[PDB]
Write a protein that binds this ligand. Structure first.
Ligand SMILES: CC(C)(O)c1cn(-c2ccc(-c3cc(F)c(CO)c(S(C)(=O)=O)c3)cc2F)c(C(C)(C)c2c(Cl)cccc2Cl)n1
Ligand SMILES: CC(C)(O)c1cn(-c2ccc(-c3cc(F)c(CO)c(S(C)(=O)=O)c3)cc2F)c(C(C)(C)c2c(Cl)cccc2Cl)n1
Lengths: 228, 230
């Protein structure tokens, strides 16, 4: 059963998301060009951040939070929301990512703005895994809102309230996926599991030079010892 | 209605969870500068046992021994910390607000902070422990969530991710059913468990930001603990 409350809420989510996108002054897509490209992407991100602020203000429940927690929520989730939105715009065929519905970008374009391959591959890796899933726009809208309302982000002063406001969007995703693919039942938990790997991706962008990890291939000798 | 096949998967989890623990009940350097250092040395010892227990447990998890060694190790290295947080949660008592390590060893927030460990890490643990406690999990539910956690394909250095994700499927599915049979009317309780694997991702990476803390005591981390942890 989609409740009338749900069915209206998802319409508001999807319309809020559309009304974001259709809202050019950006340095045109082309040393100078590799900088032009880099600044191109910088401005792509800048607009992205503002979209995500405007989407959020329209998520029932959001503007009811304390202003501090609103900000704390958006700080923490911007890069996860950017990632999810990019997966949303990933075209699996052309193997390309479409920004401002129109401009198309492949690995190579990103490498050529001088970008960290070590982070472009994860991006792409994420987009393809999301593709398998077959999300629609309601599903991403809903996944985003759930992602906005994470009680565990730093500087949340009212986590229990954040956590109560999350629940509406967890129920609606739960019902939407039960109606959409009723013979599956693991598509719901699989979507939510991407929020897990999505948190690890995110923490890699912001990694501190004093807390860099990555061991690579080679096995831990001492753990292997313990193993047999 | 939990299938017979899942019940048995679950019995196997709960039984290994129990063989795990029963193993060790001590030789851990006794609880009391010297004061601080002997406390952290104690916890350091507790962490080493926990590693043995986690390795012993994951061995007994259906399907684990079927992965390649490389992958087996990779998976363990990356989850050790999350499993340790998940098992600290389970050992958390919200009336006394204490964590029970081993059997009957009892620790409060201030025990840990008195070992030189920092608020930035210890508090989130106790916040996370408290949150888990409101979930009301029983042992199967933990054993299952730990297995789901072990089977995470997106781990650093994993060569058969498809094989590990597929292994993760029967554990999610068994959790789903186990939760709907246990609170047939609280259908958000399951998502709320899954969201916790998310939280733990973050806790794990808050842990990796502790090196200044450890790199400055000038007595070294046991080497197992050194690699498991960096
Ligand atoms: C240049 C710099 C600072 O390194 C840099 C810049 N961006 C960057 C950030 C966000 C967007 C982006 C994400 C979106 F969801 C949307 C949709 O609202 C849009 S857009 C054009 O308004 O349609 C733009 C594009 C980017 F290129 C990045 C990173 C974060 C790597 C990045 C990159 Cl490339 C692609 C995809 C995701 C991410 Cl998150 N890095
Ligand atoms: C001081 C040092 C060496 O840096 C350090 C050490 N530990 C530490 C790590 C694991 C365990 C622990 C976890 C378990 F799941 C279990 C049960 O298997 C047990 S036990 C005694 O076998 O019952 C012991 C206890 C600890 F004290 C920690 C941190 C990681 C903060 C820590 C602390 Cl305190 C409590 C809870 C989680 C975490 Cl992860 N840090």
């Amino acid at each position: 059963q989609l409740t009338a409350a749900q069915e209206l809420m998802i319409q508001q989510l999807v319309a809020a998301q559309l009304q974001c996108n259709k809202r050019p002054k950006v340095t045109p897509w082309p040393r100078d060009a590799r900088q032009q490209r880099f600044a191109h992407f910088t401005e792509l991100a800048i607009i992205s951040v503002q979209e995500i602020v405007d989407f959020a203000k329209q998520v029932p429940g959001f503007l009811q939070l304390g202003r501090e927690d609103q900000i704390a929520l958006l700080k923490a989730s911007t890069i996860e929301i950017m990632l999810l939105e990019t997966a949303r715009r990933y075209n699996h065929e052309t193997e390309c990512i479409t920004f401002l519905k129109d401009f198309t970008y492949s690995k190579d374009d990103f490498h050529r703005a001088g970008l960290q391959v070590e982070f472009i591959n994860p991006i792409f890796e994420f987009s393809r895994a999301m593709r398998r899933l077959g999300l629609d726009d309601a599903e991403y809208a809903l996944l985003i809102a759930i992602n906005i309302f994470s009680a565990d982000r730093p500087n949340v002063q009212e986590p229990g309230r954040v956590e109560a406001l999350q629940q509406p969007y967890v129920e609606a995703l739960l019902s939407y996926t039960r109606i959409k693919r009723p013979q599956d039942q693991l598509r719901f938990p699989r979507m939510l599991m991407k929020l897990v790997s999505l948190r690890t991706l995110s923490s890699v962008h912001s990694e501190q030079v004093f807390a860099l990890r990555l061991q690579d291939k080679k096995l831990p000798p001492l753990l292997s010892e313990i193993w047999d």
